[PDB]
């Protein structure tokens, strides 16, 4: 029987996670974030260490009979941004490429009907 | 049969009659000119022509003036017209504009005046 | 050498920021996406039907914003 | 004067140069097939309006292209590793009959040290040594991003051959060796894809760069 796990695909403007659970998403397979492929802390977001931790994810759920995924884009949510970091859409076209059966890609980003005050004060981050 | 040929400074003035293949730069063989690329280019044209043409007709072109490749050149135009003139067929018209173009057009190209501002250099020359 | 030919069928416009890389739309000639139509970039001069070999046929422009 | 005139009169068949009739040579690469000009011509040289033609660059013959490109190739801003590559002595620029007998010289060298066609060599060497991918600064509100690009055929063609000619040039410079030993060494190194040769190398780091920049 075909075998579907999930892909969780987080993305922030910092660093992208990539992390490869069973149909439930109790039990870990793959957990790959940008510092494992990348020596400069500014590079982690990056579309490139993106696709290839997630390429190196992929095979690796390859070799434990892993062979169809869900994705599940993760924005950081909450009271910060709501933008996937340019990362992602690279890490799902690598997940693509690496030989995985892609099926649903949705949003989990968790939006709040009401939430906390975010964060940088009254008069913004004053950059 | 007379015909001419103008190519940067150096002017061709040739004439083609019968004769038995001899064709001659300045009353001179065209086989034991000095430079050899000059000699491919005076030679183009009765190559492609054929070996009949070659040995049909005699040729003397005098050039002068230019470089000794704008020489050859203009010898090469003034020929080239020489075999025209003097077979009048189509086909090698055709086949002379079809492995290039100079030969029946001539390259009316010349050197443009040097301009003030480091003239000496060129024309579009100028200091730093 | 991993290579895929492609031809070049429409010119989307210059791109890039000095222009000097054009957009074009190329179908994939051979591998995995036959026929599949991309939107890819030319360094360097270019024409309609044009065989542009590729490295990677996933990557992909995004569409010139005026 | 003996072999001069015997090299006169043997490409009275139409032959490229004095020998290797182009009949033989075979395009591997596709893209470079309606590109790489092949047509007979016994001179390499046409003193044409290529430039003034946006496409005219290719009815140029690929020999003379390279005999432009070699009588080029002296000084630039290319301090590769810390070298001015500059023709002090009788230098290439202008003087179109040196550089003639140049690549005569070495189309004879890769003739009789490889024993079969040296334009199929070169045709080899070329398809060897384009590279397939390049880098552009692209930018987003001043935020620059290194962007692999792909090179078009002609481009790729352009930038070989200048790889090739820059190696010749790297090798023969400041050396005993001269001018067609090193141009020789370098088209055959690049015909069999050897890393030893400036152009299939810098194919190598042209293709790679761009690697990482997607």
């Not at chain 1, 870990?28 to 400069?40: D, E, F, H, L, P």
């Not at chain 4, 200048?162 to 088209?187: D, P, T, V, W």
Request: proline share 5%; net charge positive.
């Amino acid at each position: 029987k075909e075998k579907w796990g999930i892909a969780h695909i987080y993305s922030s403007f910092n660093n992208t996670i990539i992390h490869i659970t069973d149909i439930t998403g109790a039990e870990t397979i793959s957990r790959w974030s940008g510092g494992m492929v990348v020596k400069a802390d500014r590079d982690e977001p990056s579309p490139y260490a993106a696709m290839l931790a997630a390429r190196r994810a992929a095979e690796e759920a390859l070799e434990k009979g892993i062979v169809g995924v869900h994705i599940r884009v993760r924005a950081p949510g909450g009271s910060k941004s709501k933008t996937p970091g340019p990362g992602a859409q690279a890490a799902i076209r690598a997940l693509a490429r690496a030989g995985l059966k892609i099926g649903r890609v949705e949003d989990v980003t968790p939006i709040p009907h009401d939430g906390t005050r975010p964060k940088g004060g009254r008069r913004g981050r004053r950059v | 049969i007379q015909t001419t040929g103008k190519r940067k400074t150096a002017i061709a003035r040739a004439v083609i009659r019968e004769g038995k293949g001899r064709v001659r730069i300045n009353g001179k063989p065209v086989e034991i000119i000095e430079p050899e690329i000059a000699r491919f280019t005076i030679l183009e044209p009765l190559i492609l022509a054929g070996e009949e043409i070659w040995n049909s007709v005699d040729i003397d072109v005098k050039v002068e003036g230019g470089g000794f490749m704008g020489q050859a050149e203009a010898a090469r135009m003034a020929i080239a017209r020489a075999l025209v003139e003097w077979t009048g067929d189509m086909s090698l018209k055709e086949k002379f504009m079809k492995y290039d173009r100079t030969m029946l057009v001539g390259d009316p190209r010349r050197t443009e005046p040097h301009k003030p501002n480091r003239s000496t250099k060129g024309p579009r020359a100028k200091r730093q | 050498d991993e290579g895929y030919p492609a031809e070049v069928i429409e010119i989307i416009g210059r791109t890039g920021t000095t222009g000097d890389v054009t957009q074009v739309k190329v179908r994939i000639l051979e591998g995995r996406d036959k026929g599949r139509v991309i939107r890819r970039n030319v360094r360097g001069p270019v024409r309609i039907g044009d065989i542009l070999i590729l490295r990677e046929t996933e990557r992909e422009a995004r569409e010139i914003k005026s | 004067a003996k072999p001069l005139n015997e090299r006169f009169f043997i490409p009275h068949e139409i032959k490229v140069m004095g020998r290797w009739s182009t009949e033989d040579v075979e395009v591997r690469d596709p893209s470079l097939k309606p590109y790489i000009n092949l047509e007979p011509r016994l001179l390499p040289h046409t003193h044409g309006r290529h430039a003034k033609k946006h496409f005219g660059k290719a009815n140029v013959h690929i020999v003379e292209r390279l005999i432009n490109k070699i009588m080029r190739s002296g000084g630039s801003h290319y301090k590769v590793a810390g070298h001015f590559m500059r023709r002090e002595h009788r230098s290439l620029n202008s003087k179109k009959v040196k550089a003639y007998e140049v690549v005569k010289e070495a189309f004879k060298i890769i003739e009789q040290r490889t024993g079969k066609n040296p334009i199929q060599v070169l045709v080899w060497a070329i398809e060897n040594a384009a590279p397939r991918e390049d880098t552009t600064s692209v930018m987003f509100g001043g935020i620059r991003y290194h962007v692999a690009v792909d090179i078009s055929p002609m481009r790729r063609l352009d930038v070989a051959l200048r790889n090739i000619a820059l190696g010749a040039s790297a090798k023969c410079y400041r050396n005993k060796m001269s001018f067609a030993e090193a141009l020789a060494e370098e088209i055959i190194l690049a015909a069999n894809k050897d890393p030893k040769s400036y152009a299939y190398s810098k194919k190598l780091e042209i293709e790679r760069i761009a690697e990482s920049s997607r």
